[PDB]
Design a protein around this ligand. Structure first.
Ligand SMILES: Cn1c(N)nc2ncc(-c3ccc(O)cc3)cc21
Ligand SMILES: Cn1c(N)nc2ncc(-c3ccc(O)cc3)cc21
Lengths: 11, 242, 238, 10
């Protein structure tokens, strides 16, 4: 259950 | 290091970090419906959120935080940040909200969406206040950065309180920066503190508008008016409304 | 006019003199007993709030309609800032009344709000918020919270909002006076002023959340609310 | 509306 925002904050 | 930036360097960083003004998918071949107007605003917000994330990474001090804290601050502040940007863009359009260059609406058009006109009126009032204060672009970018760092800060073992103290040191530098700007603009000492207070009290109103907008967006979701992206659904869910 | 002529020290004395009294609550709790105690207390505090508002310099210069609007917008914020203030010296607890000092960990929905209140009290404590500051902040909430939601475009309307903004500036001057008096540098004064006013954004947030809670409580119609409280709630679904 | 009105006058 990985938040989309958490991933986008890395890209 | 945020804390070592001068006031002028802080202002430059913030102005350079500003996101672009995006276009809506407005289709002038057809009349609005509640659903199509909401579709446009949510489609725009979705595209704006991606640019916001990249802007936040450029706000001095923000990348020092853990990803979890970055997530929390943006979850708390996203709608306030979009709204302050809308109000800023609308300053030179009395009576209208420049959602986009191809989507400049008045309150009568806002009535197309159930419960939206009340929020429109609050946004228009805030735009008027900005215009009447002659809010400057340099002050605006300071205020938007204050929202990002402040809104979720009191919802934050003890490297925890170091995160919190870090945020507060950064917020102190942004205050210093606002005062510098006002001084440079020729304001008297008394005028500086009075204007600082007027600007910061508007953040209370922006918070209020965000809370009302989030309740409204949740009702649109709960009535199946518009499909929200997975991102918007998660941002909305962070606020956990009923 | 009185307010614009007051000195910083006289504003502070006026605000201290205007302060409402601390009231008491009415064995084990239920969910129902709990909220009844809180809403009964709120109702009694609201009557005292009205007298206090009338003593805030500038407020009686306003029309009765403007006074109603400001109080309808601000009342829960004002109750909440009072609660936070009373709780400063009681870490982890909210001092609803001297005989109702409640810890965090039983009202469906209340915990998120309690936690926000506790965090604000903790913030006050960390800043060493002073009583003279607190009263300035509570008056700012009264005058600020509804000032942009004045609807009419009339000439009487703007003269109104302008008077409110001149009063707000005098309260800012008063906060700065207190800070200067206390030995703060100019830089420290400006920083502290900002810190205090940013807390008002959090108080607004807590009020908005609490109002949602109170509205669901009303509809469910199991906890008794006063006619007055029902009125005040009514104003926010409008 | 009304209760608050009366309280303010009273
Ligand atoms: C009021 N409102 C509701 N209920 N949902 C919404 N989604 C997005 C917006 C909005 C605000 C500012 C923008 O620049 C773009 C969309 C505004 C919204
Ligand atoms: C959190 N909360 C909700 N949801 N409804 C409420 N009604 C009244 C109070 C309250 C707040 C401060 C007081 O000093 C007394 C009651 C607090 C309330």
């Amino acid at each position: 259950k990985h938040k989309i925002l958490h991933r986008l904050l890395q890209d | 290091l945020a804390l070592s930036l001068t006031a002028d360097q802080m202002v430059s960083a913030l102005l350079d970090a500003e996101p672009p003004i995006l276009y809506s998918e407005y289709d002038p071949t057809r009349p609005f419906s509640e659903a199509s107007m909401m579709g446009l605003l949510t489609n725009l917000a979705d595209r704006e959120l991606v640019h916001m994330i990249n802007w936040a990474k450029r706000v001095p001090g923000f990348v020092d935080l853990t990803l979890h804290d970055q997530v929390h601050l943006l979850e708390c502040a996203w709608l306030e940040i979009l709204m302050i940007g809308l109000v800023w863009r609308s300053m030179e359009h009395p009576g209208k909200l420049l959602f986009a260059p191809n989507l400049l609406l008045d309150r009568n058009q806002g009535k197309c969406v159930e419960g939206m006109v009340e929020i429109f009126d609050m946004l228009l009032a805030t735009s008027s206040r900005f215009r009447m204060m002659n809010l400057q672009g340099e002050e605006f970018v300071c205020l938007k950065s204050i929202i990002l760092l402040n809104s979720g800060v009191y919802t934050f073992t003890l490297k925890s309180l170091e995160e919190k103290d870090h945020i507060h040191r950064v917020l102190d530098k942004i205050t210093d920066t606002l005062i510098h700007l006002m001084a440079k603009a020729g304001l008297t000492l008394q005028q500086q503190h009075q204007r600082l207070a007027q600007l910061l009290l508007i953040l209370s109103h922006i918070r209020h508008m965000s809370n009302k907008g989030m309740e409204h967006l949740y009702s649109m979701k709960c009535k199946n008016v518009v499909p929200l992206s997975d991102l918007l659904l998660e941002m909305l869910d962070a606020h956990r409304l009923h």
